[PDB]
Amino acid sequence: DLKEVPRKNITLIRGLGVYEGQVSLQVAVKTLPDFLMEALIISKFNHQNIVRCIGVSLQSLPRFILLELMAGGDLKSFLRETRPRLAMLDLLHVARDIACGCQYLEENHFIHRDIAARNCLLTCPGPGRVAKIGDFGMARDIYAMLPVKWMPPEAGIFTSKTDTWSFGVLLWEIFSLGYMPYPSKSNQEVLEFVTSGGRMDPPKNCPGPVYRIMTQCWQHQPEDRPNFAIILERIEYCTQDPDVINTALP
Numbered sequence: 017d018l019k020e021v022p023r024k025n026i027t028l029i030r031g032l033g034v035y036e037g038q039v040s041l042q043v044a045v046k047t048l049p050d051f052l053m054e055a056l057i058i059s060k061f062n063h064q065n066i067v068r069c070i071g072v073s074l075q076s077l078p079r080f081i082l083l084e085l086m087a088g089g090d091l092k093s094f095l096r097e098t099r100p101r102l103a104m105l106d107l108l109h110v111a112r113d114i115a116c117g118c119q120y121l122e123e124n125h126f127i128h129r130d131i132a133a134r135n136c137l138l139t140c141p142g143p144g145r146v147a148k149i150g151d152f153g154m155a156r157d158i159y160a161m162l163p164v165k166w167m168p169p170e171a172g173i174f175t176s177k178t179d180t181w182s183f184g185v186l187l188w189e190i191f192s193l194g195y196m197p198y199p200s201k202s203n204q205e206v207l208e209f210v211t212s213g214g215r216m217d218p219p220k221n222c223p224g225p226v227y228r229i230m231t232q233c234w235q236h237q238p239e240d241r242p243n244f245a246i247i248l249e250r251i252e253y254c255t256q257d258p259d260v261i262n263t264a265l266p
């Protein structure tokens with residue numbers, strides 16, 4: 017099924033997080049000390065905003081999965097490290113990028129169930145970045161450690177509207193510039209806070225239009241939340257608005 021690439025052709029260059037690799041083509045190598053199936057899931061996707069599975073090395077040990085090299089690393093760490101001391105449109109492109117990928121999943125009736133900044137990767141760190149969904153461990157596991165801050169109330173049900181909720185929270189992560197959702201609240205506090213109707217305030221300097229996308233992502237009833245086509249449409253509207261784009265980051 018998956019393209020078994022000879023170990024002879026594979027060489028490990030550098031430890032990234034989890035290796036920088038080459039094949040006799042610069043790739044990223046994920047090693048195993050289940051795992052047969054994250055690669056099988058990622059392999060079946062064909063979209064520009066989802067990391068590509070180059071191949072696998074299950075012949076020798078330790079078993080590899082060859083993946084599209086994302087030199088910019090995860091999105092959570094990027095926001096943190098690249099915090100002004102980067103413009104609003106850079107955030108909007110990142111948001112659009114993941115929204116496209118989510119739309120692709122939604123169209124293909126796949127539920128991610130863990131859409132967060134820590135599961136998104138960046139191609140290069142500088143301008144011309146492309147954010148892509150890099151982790152699918154949660155959706156595999158099914159097919160304290162639970163991501164409660166990204167989950168809607170009815171999650172124990174899971175829909176495409178689940179991913180809509182978590183994307184709203186991802187949206188906050190982006191425009192907060194990498195802050196932890198519900199900053200001073202624990203999983204159980206957030207659980208009861210959300211269940212009561214409580215929602216996160218706008219991140220510092222966040223334009224109203226963008227916060228309004230977060231707000232309707234967090235609608236209590238799933239059928240009232242927007243699909244990702246509408247979300248993109250609305251992100252595109254923000255990208256047209258100059259009052260949104262001209263707003264200076266904190």
Ligand SMILES: Cn1cc(-c2cnc3[nH]cc(-c4cnn(Cc5cc(F)ccc5F)c4)c3c2)cn1
Pocket residue numbers: 032033034044046051054055058067081083084085086087088089090137150151152153
């Ligand atoms: C600084 N930094 C860069 C990276 C990085 C760069 N490029 C990358 N390309 C693919 C990855 C990656 C790493 N883990 N995953 C999740 C994953 C986990 C798994 F168990 C099986 C497959 C799989 F894709 C994707 C990946 C990670 C990690 N840290």
